[PDB]
């Protein structure tokens, strides 16, 4: 009993010991892939966070450019109006 | 004839803003149109950002599992090593 039950024992434990080989290659491994992929997700969400940022910009941008056009296209109402009634005076001397 | 003279110039001095007032305004409407285009590219790339992020998080989450995973099993066999030389210890003993 006792040879052959160590016998069993001693190709019990060669096989536990590649299995161990390999996974203390695969931890340095692993190892190695979670820092890159670490990188990567901090690289795109601290770049979503900066083109937040930079939409939040270019909405004030866009909204500052629309107020201007209404004041623009009200100071252009204000001319024209201001010219009739100048031609309308003129037209009273002409005459 | 004067009060006609003071309104020519005056209709003059008006004529000259109009044309600064439409001037600026083709240049509002063509600066208005490029931000809104900037727009359209930052939500373009926005939304390409968020699927590299639920990639990104996928992989992590994948990753993390995986060394999690790999290290029990590092522990697993560990044990079953020191369980099996302490039984091939007791038989050497005889």
């Not at 992929?37 to 866009?62: G, H, P, S």
Request: hydrophobic share 30%.
């Amino acid at each position: 009993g006792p040879g052959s039950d160590s016998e069993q024992l001693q190709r019990e434990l060669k096989e536990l010991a590649l299995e161990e080989e390999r996974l203390i290659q695969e931890l340095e491994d692993v190892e190695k892939n979670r820092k890159v992929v670490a990188e990567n997700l901090e690289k795109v969400q601290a770049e979503a966070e900066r083109l937040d940022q930079e939409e939040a910009q270019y909405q004030r941008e866009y909204s500052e450019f629309k107020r201007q056009q209404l004041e623009l296209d009200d100071e252009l109402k204000s001319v024209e109006n201001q010219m009739r009634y100048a031609q309308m005076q003129l037209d009273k001397l002409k005459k």
